[model samples]
Target: PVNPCCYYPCQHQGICVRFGLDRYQCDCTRTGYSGPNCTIPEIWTWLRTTLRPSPSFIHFLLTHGRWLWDFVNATFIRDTLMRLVLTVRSNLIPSPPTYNIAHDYISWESFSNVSYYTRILPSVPRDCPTPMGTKGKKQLPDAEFLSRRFLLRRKFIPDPQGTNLMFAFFAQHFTHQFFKTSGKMGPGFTKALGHGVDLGHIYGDNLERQYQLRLFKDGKLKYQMLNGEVYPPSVEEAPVLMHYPRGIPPQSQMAVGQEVFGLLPGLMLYATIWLREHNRVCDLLKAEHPTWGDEQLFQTARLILIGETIKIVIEEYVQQLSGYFLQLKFDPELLFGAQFQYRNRIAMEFNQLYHWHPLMPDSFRVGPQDYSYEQFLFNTSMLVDYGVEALVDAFSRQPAGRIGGGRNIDHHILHVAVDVIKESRVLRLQPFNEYRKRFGMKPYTSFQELTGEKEMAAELEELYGDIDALEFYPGLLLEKCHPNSIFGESMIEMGAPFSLKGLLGNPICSPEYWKASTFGGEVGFNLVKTATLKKLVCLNTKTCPYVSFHVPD
Candidate 1:
């Protein structure tokens, strides 16, 4: 005989009572339902329960009644609501399982440091879709072909939110700090120094790399002055080495942290700002404590810089992406004394989520000159010749393309799209629907639902045959955008958890680390509080009158 409660005969959360092994009755107390199985809705009880405000909500209103009408009250209300929603969604997803292999083992301790990328979900089995292209007698379309068809830009489409090129540039510059891929360790692992937003992209990830950038005077980084403007010392002037992409001019190279930043204009721009900021903070620290040694000033300034970077990220960069009415504030004191795990590891899928090539247009104008996508690569001359103000103004005024479907990624970078797909297959990542389920989201029932374009849907159907067979990378790229949001629903869901968790869980956010003393007293702490991307750009550039992530309306 089966247990009577096994079938869950109760309705509307009514308790199921067992009369015998196979017999049952429903205990409908406070359930707003009545019947043998509690399936009948009683209007009186239902209305009573539905109309009642939650106890916690009542308590909140009573405690803060005087300040409820104040403008600042929105911060607490919105922040709590947003964070609660994210926390609930994050908890629904299970942590990706790890094998006990070398360098990839899980650390069960509360605060263990591990080098491997965190897995959000386990990899798919090798034979799930047949890795060599045959899905049990059907051939899948080549990744390159899919890329050329869907990713190649046919025409430029401006962002619905009027996001500007500067926003796109900042996205690239900020993410490069942590979303580092390790060609040496293969695609599955990361080349990240440590797992936090440590600004490793500014101050080299390794000790030797750090030593090269330091001036060992007043805790300041080495810099060069040209025509009374701050610029990173030329690579030739220093012993620093950087990647020399095919057409990069010898004079274009700068001896900066992170080898890849040397190859792009926007990357070089942000690197220069941070370098300047670091040295500027060092000078302030030196003035405050005249007897302090170079080492103390350097270490203190580094800590202050980290706080400033994270504040800019959360308060400025992420706030723009969220598009929420409630301002997302970075309150380090909020998490103090909380039982939170203050450790992090970058995720491989998180790297895949940022393949946002669609945001870049075919070409952009800097002053009177137009630069094509091809020339944009390894072109630091834009920053060097026109200066930071011109570069910032050009990027701030130009509109970024909307992310998604028809003709997005430029034709020149189509090869990168192909590589992304191939890498996902190599890692044997689960299908898009599986990831959806993992993130506490409903799986798409049809191709049209996933892409929102009938033609793209039909093509996807023909390629995969079944909706369940859709690959993770393509799913992220093609998934329909959420209303009034910059990214697709899946992208936002997957990315928010990683971004928020990594940021909030940083060592600096911990009780011990989140202090004025930790940041070199009140002056440094206030500097971090006042930090914003707009301020950073405006403060560093002599002629940048205004800064924004949106196009000039």
Candidate 2:
């Protein structure tokens, strides 16, 4: 037989490959053998026999032992177990009482509490006046005008403590009115139990008795007849009250409209209390000089102003919610859809309103007693602008699946501006177009161009060290094996065979020599490959994982 080492190299034995000039190593083919040749099998057998274990069996044992070793060595598992034990211990621990951080930040010198104050106090000039006659008005003294302006500025800023006091005051007034007119049972009780005793009957009758006239229905004269005729008419036309031998009509002559009207006085009374409380707080602040710096004062003022805005906005939202509740109670199905829409719109509008804050000039200083209603109104108007915009934007961007399917174009446009205002850090002094450019886009721009193909695929990569073995493929592989074959005995076989068959009984193999054939399929494949390669960036830094084959750059 020919030497098997020449072709098969190490058939049933170990093969020796020379490295350098004098160094050579043998790769043993048989598990029981060692050294450069098959002569060591007897020695290996003796060694294994002494050890009482097969080499393959030892390898199998080690393979399973590796998994156990890895599990024991895992750092994450150890850390997680430690954390679990700590968490369990923490459950037994008691938490300390929470403390107010706001109090700690606030200085007593900066805060004032004057419950009894009335007159407006003057302060240093902060805001400058407009050029003379700009709004068609004569020039006023700078000190007087500035003091007035500062007070006007305070109207925009809300004091939370002051507002709460106002709310309390209103609550007291409302309670008093509610009890006085409707009796000790109150408005809710009267609405439920008193059938004919409405607010109108109570107030209107009281007004007629006290003021000698009907206060209901546009202040009409109840006792006087029509066309100013005060005399008694025929039996058919004569009023029952005029000829009654018995006592006056029962006090329960309440009308539906009159009941609603009765509630208005209570509302007005509460509003007055709020206004007075607010004014009182302003007075208190004006009495004291600001010991804090400009930034501190500005922040304090801004917080108060923003808080007031929130109160008003919240009040409006509550009113809307109440209105919806009333509508739902009366016409359930007819107003159900509209109620949902209005609630959603109001919620969105409220969020926008909450985000808005009036921009106070750096030079402005607000004293407690000094009040400016105009400035407050202006600030409130700005907040309304923001709210309206948000409402419009919300409707415009509503998905097609929603109840309203893209019909309200005007609302949508309004919302676009609203969204911009909502995101803006400060209200714009200029037009919308000019303000939009500051946000990195032209007005009315679409998102499609902002995120295009060329922009999406920017390649980046980092490299380090010399290149070693290039991996072609990775992961598991399956191969065909055979014990014996007709052509090749005791040899494993795998892979597909080459072919040269074509459509016209012609050979089709090499691309270089191929003619009268189109390479259409390669076009799409090439484009995909190119695009992928162009988009991806490969870093050669071995900062994390080891190099692996088939990893896209």
Candidate 3:
């Protein structure tokens, strides 16, 4: 997979093709630093973008403003050249907050399967008027019927590797300590779980509010220890390893179900890379700056790690999953990039829009054919499961299912996710048509208008009599996917960009973060360049020599 963003972030235009090691190189045809993606300020490109009539003349002013001053009176200069240069902190402002690690994070403990039947559930969309006349309504959907009705959608086919599978896994890690601890989302069933990133480790939980923006901490980077190991400061974070063999940790309980944690090998592999990257970076940073204080090392290292992780997700993961080489961009002209302003906070609505469960396979198998010791379904006993090596091998080798198939629809898991959502009443989602228009796309008058497919459209029409009555989750999975999009074009329109934009939209490239004082300048940026899924796997994996980066067709 050649990732074009590695070369130039494209800024916003041009094409990139395979270069070497499956990397990519850009074939630039445009001139000027400011077109679409290349909007950096420079000379020769000034004539087209300048705003003044003699914006051309104004160009000469910045470089020779003093010379131009001799010809013009102070009053005349103040109104034009002086005003233009002096007003506001033009160009880009310096850039990036908070997580509380001591308490209220996620951990591994055998849960009691708690529900809102006993506690309060936050009403979501409480601000937006309730739909379906299901107003102020509190009731669960019928599970028995939904269990078997798997509506087989023939419209969207799966990519060979079921790329959507990774997207789904990525979303699970987004759980925050804020909602889980504050009881803002729903009844708090688990606590001391160390807050965010429930995938395996306690990540970014002790969140803080800085300058009214949703920054993790320290100029918008995750907090970690500066020790040579670069581990997150020791906290009773992450779930417990189950009989887990070489894995160490009974570390203070509170966890996801063992079954779910180990059910998919993909989850395990990602968690492994996450830790290795942190350590790998710390070793380098420590060697580079042995004199820096521990806290200094930790914050600096975390910032670099965060940037690298972001680069992989936004630049490569999003591109690869889309099955198109376009999207998840950072335009320098944007509020954050131009060094201006933007609202930053977590949106629960985005959680619902990120629907990737359709990529899950019914069961896991290592070999082409299933064997007694090698086959395991979601229901299989994790404690009784086979070797970790086998599971990892299967994960590396297996092809996940296509993302959308009315036939492969697993309402079973959908029921589970919604139940969790409902338990936490804090996040209320919109129905289909409401969200359809939310993304700036037109709402379809009929199901036929939603997807060009007749039968599916007819089925959707039957499912929801009115176009506006569409529920958010159902709309996410069922809407006709856009060209080159893994999601219904309309749904992903809002979702694909918005999801990562939440993270990418932060002032990552701003001067504050890039400062040598903040994270050692060029070395920090260099760390981001070096950190990729390819490097993470190759750097930390025990079996990198034996594996293929691309999944088998």
Candidate 4:
């Protein structure tokens, strides 16, 4: 009987001709071949075949340069030649290696004090307290103040610190001015318009009394005229003025859709007040020194207000989100159900590999010397991932408590993204290859180029897909309750663009915290509920075996 190997060739091009007795020798094609008979090379030969060009393939060829040839011949090429033409150029030009005559060789000791030397001088001793109200204390730290007084001969704003006096003065004046103009007590003068006067009754009795008195008495109130009949003032006789209080109480409490308006009005009112106060301060400063420019004052006030508004908005948004998180109760572990078991297993495996590694000592054995800073950072980073994985697993098994199941939510969402990226394999094409193809060049051949492109594309696509999928998952899960319901857009917007810096800034809760709070709370609640359910089920079916009944429950 003929051997199976002899009759059939491997797809990867293994030679079937070498089989002995019942076996066959399948001579595999070297390196880049793939065929049932091991006779065909995988490399495209446009000259020999009538195969129609695929758009994607043609695009690839046009984008990638003739770099594959260089890679294939790299073994024979010198490093100098590689640097001159083939190797990718970097923005960081190579500095010529310098000889160290003072030391035996360049060492870490030289670079050790780099931060200290390059950074500002060490802070002055705080222990040497500068006494307030002393002669020297009243004097400016530098000569700028003395010169301003002598040459400009203007009333000088005292410098609190030597650096940037103008900015300090402007900031102070702006803040004060904002408060004054915006600050006032009432639309009309009143003695309480007196205590215990029911607002409803007061409003009814004096609907136009203040205006009438203002017109008759030149906007003054007389105690002697309290009980007399007051007539409504004519519009022309009342100075044609509208009286609006600096601040007004809301007619009613915030209603459903009026939250933004309710909150914003107070802010606007405060800002208006601030601007008024700023104008006053500017007037005062100008009065003190006639040479002070109006343009400078206006610009400074505008800058101050703009900066403050931005700061306030950012702060308010953060506070609101923090409050929302505090109120949230959803547990991510409960959502995962049976999947937690698998998650736990993965975590345990990672922990074992990282914490119990036998090669740790060997890894650190760089002669007798200790690990370098680079080694320390690398090892710590690896260990942190392992530790974090283990923590996540531990949390997964636990119950949700306070702070909601934020960690579990983050982990599962991130995992989904990772899975999507891994499966999509979008990063297979490098930028250079893509760019070359755009210009109708051939694809790169080097293993590094090919592998790097594949990996990067895969990573970026995976992350993008994962984030998109995660955003949709909550709505998808909610569909069980209301099939037609659409969820609101994300309230907690990502301020920073997606990048390494943004990733670092993202406020993801740690697994450990989630386990301790949100998961713990969830478990505690479920345990009691589960017990009650089990008892109820058991009582209802006496003859039914507890085993089967319990399983369903």
Pick the TM-score winner.
1
The model with the greater TM-score, 1 or 4, is: 1
Per-residue lDDT over 416-471 for candidate 4, one digit per residue giving the tens place of the 0 to 100 score:
32322221121111122222222223333432232223443343233323211211
Query: Which is the winner by lDDT between candidate 1 and candidate 3?
Result: 1
Number of the top candidate by lDDT? Answer: 1
lDDT of 4 at 339: 14
RMSD of each: 8.3, 39.6, 17.8, 36.0
Best-to-worst TM-score order: 1, 3, 4, 2
Rank list by lDDT: 1, 3, 4, 2
Error at 395, model 2, angstroms: 37
Better of 2 and 3 by TM-score: 3
Candidate 3 per-residue C-alpha lDDT over 1-553 given as tens digits, one digit per residue, 9 for 90 to 100: 3233332333322333445765654434553455444546457546544642432232233325454444553345333432232112121111111111111112222112221111111122222333332322233233233223433323334545345333444434433221233344343333323212222132333232111111222222232332222222111343223323333334211123221334434543354345555556566677777676655555666666556755666556655554431233322223332333331223344444454556554544555645332343222323124333334455555455555434454444555445433532333343455445434345567767765577767755565556565555555555555443345455445554444434434455454454545556567667675555556566754354323323645
Model 3 ranges off by over 4 Å: 1-130, 133-147, 150-157, 160-204, 207-265, 327-343, 367-393, 411-414, 417-428, 451-456, 483-485, 542-553
Summarize candidate 2's per-residue lDDT along 301-402 as a digit string, tens digits.
222222232223223222221111111111112222221111000111111212111211112112222223334211212212222122222212211110
Q: What is candidate 1's lDDT per residue for 1-553, written digit by digit as tens?
A: 5554543455554555557555878778765678887767788866766686643343244335455434544556755654554454344322432321122223563124345565665454333334322232245568988888877788876677678888888888888878777788777666675866888877777777777887878998888886688988766555576785656435656778787887778888878888888888887888888998988899889888788888888877876776554556788666553445676667767777778888888787786889886677776677778777778888888888887654678787778888989887776565687677556367789889998779989988888887777887888888877544455677767777777777777788788788888877789898888887777877777765446888887
The lDDT for every candidate, in the order shown, is 0.71, 0.22, 0.41, 0.23
